[PDB]
Amino acid sequence: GEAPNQALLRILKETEFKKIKVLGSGAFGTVYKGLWIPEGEKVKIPVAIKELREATSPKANKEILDEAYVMASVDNPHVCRLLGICLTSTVQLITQLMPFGCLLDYVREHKDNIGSQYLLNWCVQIAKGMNYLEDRRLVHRDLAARNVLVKTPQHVKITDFGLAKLLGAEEKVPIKWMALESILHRIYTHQSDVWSYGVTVWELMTFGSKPYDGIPASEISSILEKGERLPQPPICTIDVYMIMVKCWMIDADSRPKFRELIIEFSKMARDPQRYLVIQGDERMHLPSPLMDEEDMDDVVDADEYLIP
Ligand SMILES: */C=C\C(=O)Nc1ccc2ncnc(Nc3cccc(Br)c3)c2c1
Numbered sequence: 001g002e003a004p005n006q007a008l009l010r011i012l013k014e015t016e017f018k019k020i021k022v023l024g025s026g027a028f029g030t031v032y033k034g035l036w037i038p039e040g041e042k043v044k045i046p047v048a049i050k051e052l053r054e055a056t057s058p059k060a061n062k063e064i065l066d067e068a069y070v071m072a073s074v075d076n077p078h079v080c081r082l083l084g085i086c087l088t089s090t091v092q093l094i095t096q097l098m099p100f101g102c103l104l105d106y107v108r109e110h111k112d113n114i115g116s117q118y119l120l121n122w123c124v125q126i127a128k129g130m131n132y133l134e135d136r137r138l139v140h141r142d143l144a145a146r147n148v149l150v151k152t153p154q155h156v157k158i159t160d161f162g163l164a165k166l167l168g169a170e171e172k173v174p175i176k177w178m179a180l181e182s183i184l185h186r187i188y189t190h191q192s193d194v195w196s197y198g199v200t201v202w203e204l205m206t207f208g209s210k211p212y213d214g215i216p217a218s219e220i221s222s223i224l225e226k227g228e229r230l231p232q233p234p235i236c237t238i239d240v241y242m243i244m245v246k247c248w249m250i251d252a253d254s255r256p257k258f259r260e261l262i263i264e265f266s267k268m269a270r271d272p273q274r275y276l277v278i279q280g281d282e283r284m285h286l287p288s289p290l291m292d293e294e295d296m297d298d299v300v301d302a303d304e305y306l307i308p
Contacts, residue, residue: 035047047094104203144196167190224248
């Protein structure tokens with residue numbers, strides 16, 4: 001808002017990233033897994049390297065550098081921070097590797113081993129991450145499942161600050177995750193993130209279905225105006241769905257608050273089988289920390305790699 005933002009933006013040398021492999025791409029960008037050895041430290045940090053696609057048309061470097069600016073400003077266990085950037089031809093953004101990828105791809109992949117505890121915790125974790133953003137007064141503007149990453153099955157962080165901005169501040173478009181006032185009057189606010197949260201939750205609750213599958217984005221705003229919302233997912237009690245529905249209220253101040261959402265989901269997560277009904281959800285076991293590659297006795301996660 002008006003407090004000096006004294007985040008350190010750290011510059012990293014091409015020579016500090018041993019090993020490299022492609023992890024994802026889509027002309028929207030390219031993301032690589034790799035290793036980073038801070039020079040003069042005996043630590044090997046597993047990182048992802050993002051090198052936005054658009055050749056170099058400065059119009060790009062402008063859109064990647066804003067991202068880093070945001071990603072360098074956050075510090076919370078449920079938000080991904082920027083580790084540093086590397087300058088070379090185009091700009092590379094470097095951050096902690098989330099070894100299990102996007103939460104969206106994860107639910108799709110594990111739709112049969114995902115327990116109620118896991119889903120509801122994720123909801124608590126995301127709300128936490130998002131409430132943090134709200135405190136730093138950031139409006140994420142693109143909260144979705146595709147934009148939550150998995151460090152371990154029990155720890156998610158929010159990412160992708162391409163479109164993030166300050167509440168008040170002036171300035172693809174994902175329609176199916178957008179609040180009504182955001183499709184009509186391009187009003188964005190913490191409360192519109194709430195709506196998208198609602199949608200993210202619906203994605204998890206449906207193990208990664210596509211919102212309004214049939215419908216094309218061109219006539220979403222029309223539908224929502226009529227009062228139609230996403231259906232209630234099969235595993236969802238009315239209690240859980242009712243919270244989803246509350247996020248999708250025309251009157252934005254009537255919508256829950258990430259701080260409220262943390263509490264409500266937190267409550268539920270003490271009795272997960274009472275709020276989510278999942279076929280044979282009991283001894284639902286999930287993998288855990290991390291392995292691979294040659295020498296790795298010096299491997300340190302980003303979360304333990306701190307610098308003054
Ligand atoms: C599901 C696609 C995806 O996002 N994969 C993925 C896996 C791990 C990972 N780790 C760290 N960062 C990202 N994405 C990312 C987004 C913005 C900036 C940066 Br440096 C990285 C991923 C993505």
